[PDB]
Amino acid sequence: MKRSKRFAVLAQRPVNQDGLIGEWPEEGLIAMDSPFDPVSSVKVDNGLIVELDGKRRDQFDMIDRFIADYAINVERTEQAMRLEAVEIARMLVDIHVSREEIIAITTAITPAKAVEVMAQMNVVEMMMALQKMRARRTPSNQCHVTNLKDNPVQIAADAAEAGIRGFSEQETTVGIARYAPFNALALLVGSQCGRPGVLTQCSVEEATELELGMRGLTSYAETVSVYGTEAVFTDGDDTPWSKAFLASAYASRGLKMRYTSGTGSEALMGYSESKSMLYLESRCIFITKGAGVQGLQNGAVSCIGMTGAVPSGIRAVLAENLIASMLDLEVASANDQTFSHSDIRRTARTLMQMLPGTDFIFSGYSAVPNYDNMFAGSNFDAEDFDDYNILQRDLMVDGGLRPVTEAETIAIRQKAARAIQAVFRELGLPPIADEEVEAATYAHGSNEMPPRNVVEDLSAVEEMMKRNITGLDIVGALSRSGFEDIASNILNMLRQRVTGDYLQTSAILDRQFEVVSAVNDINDYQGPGTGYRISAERWAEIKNIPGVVQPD
Amino acid sequence: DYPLATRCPEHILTPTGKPLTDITLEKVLSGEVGPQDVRISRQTLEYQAQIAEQMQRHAVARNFRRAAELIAIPDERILAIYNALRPFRSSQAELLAIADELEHTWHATVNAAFVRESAEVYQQRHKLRKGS
Amino acid sequence: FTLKTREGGVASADERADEVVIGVGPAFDKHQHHTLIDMPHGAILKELIAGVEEEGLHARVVRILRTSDVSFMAWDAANLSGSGIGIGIQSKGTTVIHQRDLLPLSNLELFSQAPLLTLETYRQIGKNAARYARKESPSPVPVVNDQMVRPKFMAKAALFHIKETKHVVQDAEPVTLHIDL
Numbered sequence: 001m002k003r004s005k006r007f008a009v010l011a012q013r014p015v016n017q018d019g020l021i022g023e024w025p026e027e028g029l030i031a032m033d034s035p036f037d038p039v040s041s042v043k044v045d046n047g048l049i050v051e052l053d054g055k056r057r058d059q060f061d062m063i064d065r066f067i068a069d070y071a072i073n074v075e076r077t078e079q080a081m082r083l084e085a086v087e088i089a090r091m092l093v094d095i096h097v098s099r100e101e102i103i104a105i106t107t108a109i110t111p112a113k114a115v116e117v118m119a120q121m122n123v124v125e126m127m128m129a130l131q132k133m134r135a136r137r138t139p140s141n142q143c144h145v146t147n148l149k150d151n152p153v154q155i156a157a158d159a160a161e162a163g164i165r166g167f168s169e170q171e172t173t174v175g176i177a178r179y180a181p182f183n184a185l186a187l188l189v190g191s192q193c194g195r196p197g198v199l200t201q202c203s204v205e206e207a208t209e210l211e212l213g214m215r216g217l218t219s220y221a222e223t224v225s226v227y228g229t230e231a232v233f234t235d236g237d238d239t240p241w242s243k244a245f246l247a248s249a250y251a252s253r254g255l256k257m258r259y260t261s262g263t264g265s266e267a268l269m270g271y272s273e274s275k276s277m278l279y280l281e282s283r284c285i286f287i288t289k290g291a292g293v294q295g296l297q298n299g300a301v302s303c304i305g306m307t308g309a310v311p312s313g314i315r316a317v318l319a320e321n322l323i324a325s326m327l328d329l330e331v332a333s334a335n336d337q338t339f340s341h342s343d344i345r346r347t348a349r350t351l352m353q354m355l356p357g358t359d360f361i362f363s364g365y366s367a368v369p370n371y372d373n374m375f376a377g378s379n380f381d382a383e384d385f386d387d388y389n390i391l392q393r394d395l396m397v398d399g400g401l402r403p404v405t406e407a408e409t410i411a412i413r414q415k416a417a418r419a420i421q422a423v424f425r426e427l428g429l430p431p432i433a434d435e436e437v438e439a440a441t442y443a444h445g446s447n448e449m450p451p452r453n454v455v456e457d458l459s460a461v462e463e464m465m466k467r468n469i470t471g472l473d474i475v476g477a478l479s480r481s482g483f484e485d486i487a488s489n490i491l492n493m494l495r496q497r498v499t500g501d502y503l504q505t506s507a508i509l510d511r512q513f514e515v516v517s518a519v520n521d522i523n524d525y526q527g528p529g530t531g532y533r534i535s536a537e538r539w540a541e542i543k544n545i546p547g548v549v550q551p552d
Numbered sequence: 553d554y555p556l557a558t559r560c561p562e563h564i565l566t567p568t569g570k571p572l573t574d575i576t577l578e579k580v581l582s583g584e585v586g587p588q589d590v591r592i593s594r595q596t597l598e599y600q601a602q603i604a605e606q607m608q609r610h611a612v613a614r615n616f617r618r619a620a621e622l623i624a625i626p627d628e629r630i631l632a633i634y635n636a637l638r639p640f641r642s643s644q645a646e647l648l649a650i651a652d653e654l655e656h657t658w659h660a661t662v663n664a665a666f667v668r669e670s671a672e673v674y675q676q677r678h679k680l681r682k683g684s
Numbered sequence: 685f686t687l688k689t690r691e692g693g694v695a696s697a698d699e700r701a702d703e704v705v706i707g708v709g710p711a712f713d714k715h716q717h718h719t720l721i722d723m724p725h726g727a728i729l730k731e732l733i734a735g736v737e738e739e740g741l742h743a744r745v746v747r748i749l750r751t752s753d754v755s756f757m758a759w760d761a762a763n764l765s766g767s768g769i770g771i772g773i774q775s776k777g778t779t780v781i782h783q784r785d786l787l788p789l790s791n792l793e794l795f796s797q798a799p800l801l802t803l804e805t806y807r808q809i810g811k812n813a814a815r816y817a818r819k820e821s822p823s824p825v826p827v828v829n830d831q832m833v834r835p836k837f838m839a840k841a842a843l844f845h846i847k848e849t850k851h852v853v854q855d856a857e858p859v860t861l862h863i864d865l
């Protein structure tokens with residue numbers, strides 16, 4: 001007997017820790033074309049889709065009915081659905097066919113057709129197509145800012161370092177629900193310290209988040225969830241109508257927001273209706289369209305552990321990204337959640353969206369060590385920053401991030417650490433000792449952060465939400481504290497709600513608080529010689545990484 | 553032309569009537585500008601509505617116009633209507649009463665039909681409050 | 685001494701101030717018996733209850749049959765607890781401390797990464813839950829997080845939920861559970 005050492009070494013390989021499984025269609029445990037997915041089809045009578053993917057209006061479920069009456073261009077569907085799935089896949093990759101041309105077609109097809117189109121493509125084709133269907137011409141990036149202790153001092157600090165690194169969108173969340181207000185606050189203060197114009201969100205319970213925004217503590221919301229089956233939607237505590245009203249609610253306040261969905265959600269929650277993950281996700285992205293929501297966050301997202309477990313699951317993630325794009329939605333393409341113990345494996349998953357580029361390559365890059373990631377970890381975290389920069393330089397691919405000197409960051413983290421400290425004084429919140437501002441400036445993660453009186457904090461939070469604190473109150477606390485600069489920056493963020501410019505598809509802000517969206521920065525890729533190309537300035541920044549030695 | 557900010561912002565108004573040009577750091581400090589001011593007017597939403605439909609993004613334009621009808625409604629009432637649209641919270645008569653309020657008290661014509669449609673859908677798909 | 689579960693017809697909302705209801709998933713200690721990390725439901729259920737009593741309150745076990753979503757499960761517990769403070773727990777281990785009047789998908793405390801819960805924690809969960817029932821402000825159980833739990837268990841978690849969700853009964857009232865040692 002005796003065993004092979006070769007096989008012992010492999011057995012010990014990290015990748016072998018990842019939960020993989022065989023396909024089980026009955027329970028939706030399959031990435032694409034489940035034997036139970038319907039066949040694409042459509043029929044219209046007097047301006048009303050009377051049949052949708054094999055089902056007559058008679059048997060429409062809430063989702064069906066919503067998609068049929070809100071997400072499909074009833075006038076052109078009949079003719080559009082006459083095109084073969086493969087033919088649309090071909091236009092998707094045809095440098096002679098334009099973005100707008102396919103949009104006119106895809107906005108007139110069905111959830112089954114969209115999936116059927118993806119079935120005809122390899123990842124290279126999808127990547128090829130993706131770099132053309134992307135809404136905004138310049139790819140961007142979103143990061144996560146959180147920590148095990150929902151510690152405000154470290155959040156502000158991290159948000160500053162994340163902003164100087166390049167993220168235009170920052171997301172926080174909490175271990176203890178009651179901490180939200182504080183977290184949204186430090187994220188807001190910190191975000192403007194690193195790079196003025198940074199958008200910020202606090203992902204919590206739907207009704208609680210809408211209120212945080214209404215109080216000017218956040219500038220956008222993304223995790224406004226949508227699901228592919230009724231059963232799951234209910235367990236999500238929403239309906240296409242309540243979720244669509246919520247969307248208009250945000251806009252009615254001048255707030256930017258997007259929906260969140262992703263492959264694998266329904267199966268993990270137990271009601272897939274024995275459908276494939278991509279098909280169900282397909283319905284999700286059409287709900288997003290139909291609701292009037294400008295953007296979508298998908299690509300398995302939090303359920304990457306699901307879609308990743310089965311065959312062609314990563315190709316699936318990319319495919320769901322493309323369906324959203326070719327459907328003309330802004331796309332924050334995940335890459336935000338852990339799914340593998342292998343660097344090799346997690347890199348290939350991200351490369352799918354990095355290489356071609358999306359509105360937001362990462363819709364949750366962890367700007368802090370993963371042990372601090374309150375979203376259970378991201379596909380890439382702060383300890384990967386040096387690598388991510390080297391990749392961009394390696395392949396001449398703008399990843400949406402730049403290198404930074406220890407000095408620039410230490411200083412930025414201190415300014416934000418003090419800024420938030422001052423805010424707590426003025427507002428009369430549990431003091432932030434200098435030893436804290438100190439720790440958070442040279443800290444990596446919450447391991448270097450001295451404890452805080454939770455009870456005290458939570459208690460204060462409650463008090464603050466009674467006092468009815470607003471972003472404007474934060475503006476002031478900053479002016480009276482000497483940080484006129486951040487105060488005016490936060491004010492400019494709130495101002496966005498007045499112009500309503502950052503409500504357009506793929507909208508973000510620059511240093512002067514000017515909008516940059518798919519409207520005034522249209523993507524126009526049409527094969528070599530066109531579309532985005534890193535600017536000379538941007539290339540110089542990517543190449544010139546600290547430590548690169550001059551050969552001479 | 554877009555963005556609306558840069559191009560003639562002297563006519564961009566908050567729902568309160570204050571010009572965008574008034575939302576200054578000093579006026580917020582002087583207590584003049586308040587929380588009820590930093591918001592969007594239905595005129596502004598109607599503008600983006602147009603920008604979007606001219607980009608073939610009609611669906612989003614519809615949302616913006618839907619949102620416009622909700623600007624006057626109090627924040628606490630928005631939260632209430634949203635919560636009431638959630639699964640099992642309401643009975644058919646209660647959603648239909650909200651549709652009545654929306655139409656005649658807020659003149660949110662399109663939001664009123666939206667709710668009357670949910671009422672019908674929750675009825676067919678059994679999403680109305682438990683029983684009675 | 686092994687703590688097992690006993691059925692009891694129909695559980696009714698109460699107004700007995702000194703109680704904390706603990707609602708368990710349809711399959712908890714019946715159709716399933718261990719969590720994702722193979723921890724007996726009994727020893728857990730024992731720890732929760734002991735945590736409550738340790739603070740002087742009474743703890744009544746019930747079984748939520750209407751749903752497999754721990755959030756709603758815990759919410760049912762609370763809107764059934766004369767103290768307004770309840771606890772929900774799925775068979776795979778996911779646990780939450782709710783309050784009758786928060787929204788369903790919100791909570792007081794949450795333990796979203798099942799595989800990292802220890803009997804000790806399940807005990808502290810019981811104490812804090814009771815301290816809430818006495819209108820106190822207990823320092824929440826320190827949240828724990830491991831970035832590789834999802835990669836290791838997400839797929840598995842799904843299957844367990846598939847098994848326990850098969851035992852959900854549409855509109856069924858929650859059943860009272862008797863504690864047999």
Ligand code: B12
Binds near residue numbers: 173236374
């Ligand atoms: C995967 C995930 C999801 C998935 C899966 C949900 C499911 N029911 O199966 C999806 C995207 C659908 C989801 C949705 C929501 N989530 Co979530 N979710 C996570 C995440 C990233 C990882 C959890 C995990 O994989 N654990 C590992 C496995 C093996 O352990 P498990 O015990 O079996 O894990 C279960 C729980 O975590 C549970 N769960 C997931 N979300 C929530 C939320 C609440 C309030 C509760 C009680 C339970 C719960 O789902 C897992 C089922 O496998 C965590 C982050 C974290 N710190 O854990 C956020 C997190 C737990 N989610 C959160 C929130 C707020 C939500 C929503 C309420 C958001 C919304 N807009 O409505 C919804 C709906 C909740 C519901 N009905 O379940 C918060 C909780 C904050 C708090 N109260 O303290 C977190 C911390 C952060 C975030 N915003 O992403 N979530």
Ligand SMILES: [K+]
Binds near residue numbers: 171222336
């Ligand atoms: K995100």
